[PDB]
Amino acid sequence: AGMGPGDGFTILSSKSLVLGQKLSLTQSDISHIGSMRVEGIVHPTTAEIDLKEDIGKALEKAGGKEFLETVKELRKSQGPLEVAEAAVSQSSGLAAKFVIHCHIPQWGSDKCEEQLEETIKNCLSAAEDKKLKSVAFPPFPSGRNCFPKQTAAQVTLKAISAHFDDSSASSLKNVYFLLFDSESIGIYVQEMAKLDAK
């Protein structure tokens, strides 16, 4: 019995952290981001807050004129985004309430692993600041000389645990990792196995 948060999403494997947050690896149809029953969606992007990759295009297609307008206004009012910075836009055409845009660091840059850790912590901070109960992280960008999958998964899971160890009041109860690639899924499975969970 395959089940998950909205049509297009299936939970593959989950781990429950000591203070009760649930991390769930989720088989995902990114084109169904509009149906996703998760309150916040992370949009990994650049300083310019551009709409590339499956997530950017799915948010663009679901959002319409209202979304293009909200991103344009956010660029004017808060942009450009600094490295590891997160900024929020009210959703258009989604079950989610907000899109959490973040400027992810480039692999090979000075302390990029620590900056990825800060990025993930800033996303969680942006979600909690809207009192969101759940947040979804889409696939990490995979262009030229991008972060190795094992490193990105290790760092993200470390950041998440650390954030929740440092809070006793965060509204977030569920974190989903949206994945569809068999190798990416295996990597998250291997990395989650090492956590203090269930």
Curated annotation (Swiss-Prot):
Keyword DNA-binding: yes
Domain (Macro) ranges: 10-196
Keywords associated with the record: Chromatin regulator, Chromosome, DNA-binding, Isopeptide bond, Nucleosome core, Nucleus, Ubl conjugation
GO term, biological process aspect, one: sex-chromosome dosage compensation
Subunit-structure text: The nucleosome is a histone octamer containing two molecules each of H2A, H2B, H3 and H4 assembled in one H3-H4 heterotetramer and two H2A-H2B heterodimers.
Functional description taken from the UniProt entry: Variant histone H2A which replaces conventional H2A in a subset of nucleosomes where it represses transcription. Nucleosomes wrap and compact DNA into chromatin, limiting DNA accessibility to the cellular machineries which require DNA as a template. Histones thereby play a central role in transcription regulation, DNA repair, DNA replication and chromosomal stability. DNA accessibility is regulated via a complex set of post-translational modifications of histones, also called histone code, and nucleosome remodeling. May be involved in stable X chromosome inactivation.
Protein name (Swiss-Prot/TrEMBL): Core histone macro-H2A.2
Organism annotation: Homo sapiens
Lineage: Eukaryota, Metazoa, Chordata, Craniata, Vertebrata
Entire-sequence positions represented here: 178 to 372 of 372
